[PDB]
């Protein structure tokens, strides 16, 4: 339907007037706010203890004493940090949970835009043209069920790999030249770092589903009519198709601890190569080194959040 | 050459608005599998030991 | 694709400004011309794109 374009214009207007990310980027102080928030959240592994956050933010504000044009006062950076954290929590681009602060989806999107402005890693690269080639080659073998095609693909790939093994036995192996290694490391960092992107959004989706369920229950003057449809099954009431099931499938891969065991060693081995000194700066090296543990910890936090919500909504369809 | 184009500044701006609400999820099983293959290919290419 | 063009054009402008500034030096230009490589060696983008 062509009216979907006008509906899209309306959606853009609504996002301009209501989305925290776009709201922030339009203000006059956006550069300072984004720089401070990035400096705060850059080093961290999992959230920030609130008291720890105040000290770091006050120290950063002190780093910006020369920036007096933004009312950065010298009298008391602690009070200024305390005020700023509530200012940003009210804009729901940082949230308070379990005694620690996190960055919501809006702040993540804003920072990704700002730091992709100028010096972003190149995506149009030979490495990604090989990556998509491999992935598209793999997908077809799994999309069609014909056995002859599958056996032909396997028995030709076996020949390719056998020829390559015979060549490697003769000693014709070759390693990446420095610039190819740099480019490949950059591409692999770009891929890996994107796994962490959507954790802050699964929680929003689950909270949205919970609120919708409660609104539906309360909005019917006689709850018993609908509570039957919900309580007839023992499975989780937070049946969020859009993102919950994708995250569940992602978990179904994370729990294969053998792959993680291999990855933990492989990443540090990769970072040991001399070229990794130049391809990635120190911060990126840190992020890529601990990524394996960070994904697992974040997944545990998200799973705990779902467990809490499901338990506390099951404690609500009952007694209703 | 008589044909308009979108400079990089517009490409980034459009990528921002379209990533606000309905962007494809990257935290997926497929991406986490893809990184395995890519890491393995990089490892098999960095070390020189035959 | 739209950023490689901008990088190359920026390198071109920088090269022309350097040529104009060097009112009294022929060595740099003769060095550039004798080179078989393209004059616009924008390493960060050009080589990756190539």
């Amino acid at each position: 339907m062509e009216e979907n374009t006008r509906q899209r214009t309306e959606n853009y207007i609504s996002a301009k007037n209501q989305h925290p990310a776009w709201i922030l980027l339009a203000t006059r102080r956006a550069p300072l706010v984004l720089s401070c928030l990035k400096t705060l959240f850059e080093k961290s592994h999992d959230g920030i203890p609130l008291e720890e956050a105040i000290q770091s933010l006050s120290s950063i504000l002190i780093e910006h004493v020369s920036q007096e044009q933004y009312d950065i006062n010298q009298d008391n950076p602690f009070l200024q940090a305390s005020r700023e954290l509530r200012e940003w929590i009210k804009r729901r681009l940082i949230v308070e949970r379990d005694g620690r602060i996190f960055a919501t989806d809006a702040l993540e999107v804003a920072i990704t835009f700002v730091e992709s402005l100028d010096n972003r890693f190149m995506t149009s690269t030979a490495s990604r043209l090989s990556t998509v080639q491999r992935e598209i080659e793999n997908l077809e073998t799994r999309l069609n069920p014909n056995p002859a095609n599958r056996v032909a693909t396997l028995r030709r790939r076996i020949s390719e790999l056998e020829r390559e093994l015979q060549e490697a036995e003769a000693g014709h192996i070759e390693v990446l030249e420095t610039h190819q290694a740099v480019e490949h490391i950059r591409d692999v960092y770009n891929l890996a770092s994107s796994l962490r992107a959507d954790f802050r959004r699964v929680e929003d989706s689950w909270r949205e589903a919970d609120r919708a369920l409660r609104q539906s229950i309360i909005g019917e003057q006689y709850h018993r009519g609908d509570i039957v449809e919900r309580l007839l099954n023992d499975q989780d009431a937070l049946l969020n198709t859009p993102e919950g099931r994708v995250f569940d499938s992602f978990q179904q891969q994370l729990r294969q601890s053998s792959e993680l065991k291999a990855m933990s060693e492989r990443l540090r081995v990769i970072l040991s190569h001399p070229s990794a000194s130049d391809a990635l700066n120190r911060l990126q090296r840190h992020d890529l080194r601990w990524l394996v543990k960070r994904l697992v910890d974040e997944s545990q936090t998200v799973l705990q959040a779902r467990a809490r919500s499901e338990r506390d909504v099951r404690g609500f369809m009952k007694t209703g | 050459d008589g044909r308009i184009f979108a400079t990089d500044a517009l490409e980034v701006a459009i990528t921002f608005v379209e990533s606000l609400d309905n962007r494809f999820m990257t935290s997926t099983a497929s991406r986490l599998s893809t990184v395995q293959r890519e890491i393995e290919n990089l490892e098999t290419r960095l070390n020189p030991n035959p | 694709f739209r950023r490689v063009e901008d990088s190359w054009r920026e390198a071109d402008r920088a090269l022309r400004q350097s040529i104009i500034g060097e009112q009294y030096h022929r060595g740099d230009i003769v060095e550039r011309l004798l080179n078989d490589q393209d004059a616009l060696l924008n390493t960060p983008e050009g080589r990756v794109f190539d």
Partner: protein
């Protein structure tokens, strides 16, 4: 006009190059239009539209044709720099122009 004088200087530079490489007898002191657009991009800025800058360059070339220093573009988008340019911008006049321009810059300071 000053902006015309900038193009006059560029044309004179190409003219001295061509004359020193060919000898004064030859009559084809030509230049291609596309070779001037990059030259003017450094000074007059980049409008991000080939049509706008081409219109600017052609307007300048026409205004110079009014003075007789250049012919209009031919079929191959090539112009002939009339030899009168060698007498318009010669050392006696270039020195005066430089003296005027240095005073203008000093005033700008």
């Amino acid at each position: 006009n000053l902006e015309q004088s900038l193009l006059v200087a560029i044309l004179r530079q190409h003219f001295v190059a061509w004359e020193q490489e060919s000898g004064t007898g030859a009559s084809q002191a030509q230049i291609a239009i596309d070779d001037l657009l990059p030259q003017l991009q450094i000074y007059l800025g980049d409008p991000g539209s080939e049509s706008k800058e081409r219109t600017r360059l052609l307007t300048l070339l026409d205004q110079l044709k009014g003075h007789g220093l250049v012919t209009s573009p031919d079929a191959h988008e090539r112009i002939v720099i009339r030899p009168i340019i060698a007498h318009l911008a010669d050392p006696i006049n270039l020195q005066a122009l430089l003296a005027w321009l240095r005073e203008q810059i000093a005033q700008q300071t």
